[PDB]
Symmetry: D2
Subunit: 509 residues, 4 copies
């Protein structure tokens, strides 16, 4: 009954996967914890099994990673970059089958699974350049005969906890940067994407092994809240990068702060698109649809709030209706499918409860709102009108494809409505007004970490720092100087002179 035991899925063997897989890697492969079975959300058929990390597995792995760091931190950053370049090449070689596994185990369509691996590849190639660039300024000291330099050094062991919905590229972006910065990494992925975690780790392990480097530089301990909480409380985890829900991230951030650790938090979003009266509606309508229903509404940056000016609200909603009707639904591997299932049955129960709450909170379901009659966790992409902007269900992140539509009249109020929620990840306005565009980007504009113009809430690329404000947690990944989160700054004064301090009346010999 395991999919991996069917000849239809023998391609999984190109990733080194078997019926039962080792979920711990620290140079060697193991796993003494519970055996977890992951399921394909398009049909709820079991794929394969992974033995997770026990507490003893975790302790062994943290110890091995930290010993490996003594070797890794001594390797010049450009030479660390060369390792990451080879990881990028190893991913390219497997991009089709790795992408297919993301689609199989996670549920997003194949082009998005392939594209997520491509993003990991691209950030490896970016990090290769960074490995010759990271550092700080030499500054002019006010003291004659002294140097003043800003040094950056690795923090040590970087723990990386990741969510189900980007089960490759979040780890990859953290891993590529943390590596060139001279850190070792320990990955605990979402339990429901355990096979992806193993497969990616097998690819990296082979590159480390081929370069005669200890594999614990990129360690893996598959587990759930038990292992994740251990990482949050473990003083040996110098930086904990956590991508996940706000509810969990809040508690992790506390536990790290309690031990004076460092955290990088990438939490929830409740992202708004705003269409002003002057917007190109031929741009707004497709932008809102794809941002709202992409990955079946399971991106951190999914559009969940759509503010439309009064004079165009009805036309935009009607055009969005005629468009949603053409969303093509199927298995995420099926060619030319735009829309697959939700990741779990629990997300379906969350979807239904949200549609119900919205309907009872005064909203009207103008499209969707129902479960589809088919195997897997399929729900209709949903649009809801008539809610107040402060409706409770619209302030909540429901990780499903529900787009709440609101009317507005004026700029100042709709900017405030963007900002009024607790999340602060992504935000978008559609307009042609030069003045409004620069106010949106200024101090009285959007309060989010991603602030877009005429591109929806998923508009991001690896060149910029990625992350959100407020309850999204403040962390940044990928571009700009995000690399500084993975290193420690020191401000260093070097007296190279023979000058003695002033004696101040004291007689020194």
């Amino acid at each position: 009954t395991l999919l991996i035991n069917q000849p239809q899925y023998a391609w999984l063997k190109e990733l080194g996967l078997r019926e039962e897989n080792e979920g711990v890697y620290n140079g060697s492969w193991g796993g003494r914890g519970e055996v977890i079975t992951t399921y394909c959300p398009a049909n709820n058929e079991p794929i394969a099994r992974v033995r997770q990390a026990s507490v003893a597995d975790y302790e062994e792995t943290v110890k091995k990673a930290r010993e490996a760091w003594k070797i890794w931190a001594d390797i010049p950053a450009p030479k660390r970059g060369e390792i990451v370049r080879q990881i990028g090449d190893a991913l390219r070689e497997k991009i089709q089958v790795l992408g297919s596994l993301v689609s199989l185990e996670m549920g997003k369509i194949l082009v998005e699974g392939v594209g997520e691996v491509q993003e990991y590849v691209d950030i490896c190639d970016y990090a290769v350049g960074l490995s010759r660039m990271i550092g700080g300024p030499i500054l002019p000291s006010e003291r004659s005969g002294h140097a003043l330099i800003e040094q950056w050094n690795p923090v040590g062991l970087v723990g990386i906890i990741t969510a189900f919905n980007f089960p490759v590229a979040v780890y990859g972006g953290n891993n590529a940067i943390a590596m060139i910065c001279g850190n070792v990494c320990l990955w605990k992925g979402a339990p429901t994407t355990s096979l992806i975690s193993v497969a990616v780790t097998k690819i990296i392990a082979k590159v480390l092994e081929d370069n005669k480097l200890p594999g614990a530089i990129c360690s893996l301990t598959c587990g759930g809240a038990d292992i994740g909480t251990a990482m949050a409380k473990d003083e040996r985890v110098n930086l904990l990068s956590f991508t996940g829900s706000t509810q969990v991230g809040k508690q992790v951030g506390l536990m790290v702060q309690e031990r004076f650790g460092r955290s990088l938090l990438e939490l929830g979003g409740n992202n708004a698109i705003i269409a002003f009266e002057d917007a190109d509606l031929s741009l707004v309508v497709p932008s809102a649809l794809f941002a709202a229903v992409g990955t079946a509404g399971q991106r951190c940056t999914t559009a969940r709030r759509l503010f439309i000016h009064e004079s165009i609200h009805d036309e935009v909603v009607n055009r969005l209706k005629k468009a949603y009707a053409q969303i093509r639904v199927g298995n995420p591997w099926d060619p030319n499918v735009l829309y697959g299932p939700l990741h779990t049955k629990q997300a379906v129960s969350m979807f239904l409860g949200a549609v119900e709450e919205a309907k009872k909170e005064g909203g009207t379901v103008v499209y969707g709102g129902k479960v589809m009659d088919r195997p897997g966790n399929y729900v209709e992409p949903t649009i809801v009108t008539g809610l107040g902007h402060d409706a409770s269900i619209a302030h909540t992140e429901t990780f499903a494809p529900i787009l709440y539509v609101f009317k507005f009249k004026n700029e100042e109020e709709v900017f405030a409505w963007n900002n009024e929620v607790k999340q602060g990840l992504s935000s978008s306005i559609f307009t042609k007004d030069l003045g409004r565009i620069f106010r949106w980007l200024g101090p009285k504009g959007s309060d989010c970490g991603i602030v877009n113009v005429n591109i929806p809430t998923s508009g991001a690329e690896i060149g910029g720092a990625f992350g959100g404000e407020k309850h999204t947690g403040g962390g940044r990944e990928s571009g700009s100087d995000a690399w500084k989160q993975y290193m420690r700054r020191s401000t260093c004064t070097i007296n190279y002179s023979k000058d003695l301090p002033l004696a101040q009346g004291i007689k020194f010999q």
Copy 2:
């Protein structure tokens, strides 16, 4: 019997001080809370009184500061820089009386009180330049017809909590940078330095009023832990900069994390100086004496651990003893005085407690150890030998002039002994070895935020970023790109093209 009503202290009136002072400023002066009397540590005499903030005062002041932010954030940063320049000039015009008050109320010697004001002056002129420079990169978007920009905007209200021992410069450094970054500020100083806080706030308030700006841009609510806790829990305080003990700062850090606020923590130190065998002892001995006993051992960056190579240990300890005996003790404002009192009677009890605890833990007092038989809170600067590097009392920050002296043999063990404590503020090696110097600055070297060579643990200037790692809290102030902690980053994609998204098989209108 107030010092301010005596003719010798008439100069206090040049700071605008009176017998009883209002300790709340927000555009208006006030204070309905408890009236505190502050005392001169040189003679235990009361100086003057300050009416502190009630809860109502705090509430009104936070509201007024955030209303003023609407005006202040709209002022272009170079014009905010011009205000900070004028603050710098207002400080210059009062530097002698203000530095005299620092000596009087806090107890450090006059040149250090005056020096502390000069530091604030210097950061203002630094910030004037920064006000024409802050911002982020325009980056090359991978998308045709798109721009990609990193924007920086004020966080809003920056609450600033400061310690007794740098009662002017810590606030000033936060103030100048937060101001040019577009924030309004709210200051709660240490209660035992309330008159200094009032005096500084009067100088700034005149500059704001003279420029027809709302005074709440730089608000003041004097108080103790009750006001500080309110700030730590208050979602309207967008950034809380806290300078103080690790014990208090850990709870402030957790309160801010609880509400997904931002914190900048500048906490405890336990700084080591390391003298290798090849060191210039005519540099080592004065450097250690001054870093250990300056400000009566009450700098965050005070030298509290002294590692001496075993070949030179005895010579350096005996030269230190002979140098300690020549320290000139007296009233902090008197000429040629190098050593004044501890800040509080309580600190004297802490001093004796540590001296007794170190004797129990096997240490030998080779100089000092007792309270001085004279008015004020004067204790002898103390040298303790024979302790193990891992003695508990040596791992503890005792904010008193006690120097723990250790032997060592090799570089690796003594670097680890530097890093083994929970604090991570400042550190110094004295050596001529080129390779040792660059290992100390590298990944297997010092883990502190300040890493010095041939200058002691108080070597730091405003051009670099100032702060520590580990239990020192991680925040940075003053120079380099410390300014980014007072602002929020956004990654902004602007589609300026008329290109439509790919239809992906959907028939849009």
Copy 3:
């Protein structure tokens, strides 16, 4: 007869000017060269006299400046910044009287004379911040045990040759930046603003002398082409900053290149405003007027070409013509005056020659074109329509208030017409079209050094780099990283390891 000997000009003595002034400063004041008398262009009366440098004066001054450099380069940059800060304050003290001398000797209106001194004051404060920031990155070496650092050091003597039209701020921007970068300076200003050069040098000389520094750090050798050509050919002039005509600067740049010196060239402009059909016309018309007629059309950044979409050309011409008729003309020191005289009588002749040449090339004078019937060098601000965009006089820089107006239809042609001239200083479009704006700023847009949107060609502040492309010379001044032009970069590899090179089969002892 000499204006300085008349009571109503006694304020000149506040700048330290006499009937006859020394034009050479190197610590001493001298001048064995030709005595020049400078005239007031508003009444053609002589002001005072300056004794210019002889060759012996020039030789002696270069030697004294390079000797002073030995002291000046040893002063830490932040302390060099403190000298520059004091220059800014010294200029602040004399801003009104200095701005009035600029108006008297050069002819610009008082608010622009004062504003010029203000711009020098502003770049001084900017340079104070820069003096704690200049430097290069520490970079990660690919070689184990090596450091890789980019150092920046002063080039030595920076010669500064300036033009008549900005006789304070061009020097000041070069001076303040060169000084904090550790260079000494040698100034040769325009001969017709010799009194301004002497007055500025007297202000700086006092600051240097008061700070016990050698005055040759900011040397002055007043003179004409012969002194300027000497500097161009002098190997001891490590960097020659030249501001002037394209015709002279081309020969200066060739002479410096011949000796492998460094040159910073700030040459002519032929700056265009482009108004598209969607432009805000209440913005276009005043922006065009003030940018065309400001400083009597004698700015490097003066608008000389106005491209107007065919649909709005006649309306904009008619509205400019009605606004030109209200320009208030008079003595440049009277505060109601917007429009002062041209700098010389030859300038008036060349104005008339250009008007005549425009008529011969087919152009129609729709406003102005004639000399004003009053004492001084006053001409009417002039608008010419009907020329083709490639008319020879339209491609010539004529330093007079003549605005050539052209029709256009489409964006691509009018961008090409902006770029077709040999000059490449400033350029501006007025439009609301978001895409047009970013195309103008991109690779197929303006080819100029200053590229503005909805602000005219005179829009520039000190925070950015200032300069042009093509025949404008490529130099940059003031902001961003323009400071690098005043320093020499070194890429420095430091082997701090004990490792030996590979023997490669050679037995070394």
Copy 4:
């Protein structure tokens, strides 16, 4: 008789080379100029022939390249980076055979020919990262409602003239950076390395053609001084990067300045090693040998002057002499060979003249000094003692393996003697003294663009900017912000407000 027509050289076919090769590439391959034969400098045998560019070929190619630029500059820089990434992979595929061609046509040993191709590969991977990073800052405008941005755009066509001695890497470093910066390129390499230029261009042309890009993006016009001069005079060549002798470079720099073009000059070197009394002589001697004789003395960074403290002078000379005698001479493809031929018989003649002249100027040949009796252009590596530091022949770059040795006593004199020559490329001190090291790196230290400590004059890596000062031409290649030389800066003010200019008394509409 052609080597490519002999069967032992069939590997040259792997590079696409044949008996007679087209030396023009612009999308099509051609060449109507003179047919050049290139010769193996190890045996003077002809290898193959290249058809060089006529003037008509040049004209057509410039035109086609500027046409290609219209497409290329519209490609987002990260996507141009992907093209450069593919160039790096294509070079990897041919690195052994391309390295072998470098040894065969140019004459450097095999590890260095491969090492040269590797350097290009590394700069490609660097450029890939830079392609998501290049740009300038957003700056805070002093004007309300305005943005201030620094934009960087390609200059257009970058002509690249390269020298014989790094026939792959100098072009590749210019090409990789210029390409990601949005420029098209036109290469004219040295005529004596034409086959290498063709081989590299074939590798790039396949990548461009496989990506359906116009091949003129990387154009090739093989030829001599005629083609090179045409490039220096050609206004359509927006930037001319010239690597070669100072003698030719000076004339190129003058021709480019005459037309207000941009040049990037990488000219001659006269690089000194300085050994202080405290140096590690086990590091000094092999460092001096390999830096003096590597590449048969034909690096721009070759050590040509060796200053030794008089206390250790005789010891280092004696030890250097014993190491020189072990240098292994032979065919540069022979794996056991350290030392191959000079590039041309004219190089041998120049070598002999310089040796003859060092004797006439009072020097003593203590090792070498003779041409070797064998086929090819072999000369003995040579050591000359007893010359004055200012001997004319020692101030001359002779591109040959002659090492002039000098005594010195004190630091200040020997720093001056490093700096007294007209060249300014690389420099090295060997010392342990911390203060001497930081003085070497400061304002009174080396005046060169490369300033090294305990590593000889050839110590550089791609992460840093590479180039020299004074007669070395001032240009920079490769790392840091060298990319700025391939682009044009604009400083851009964008008024997005509806604020109108102040009327200044004028009544507008």
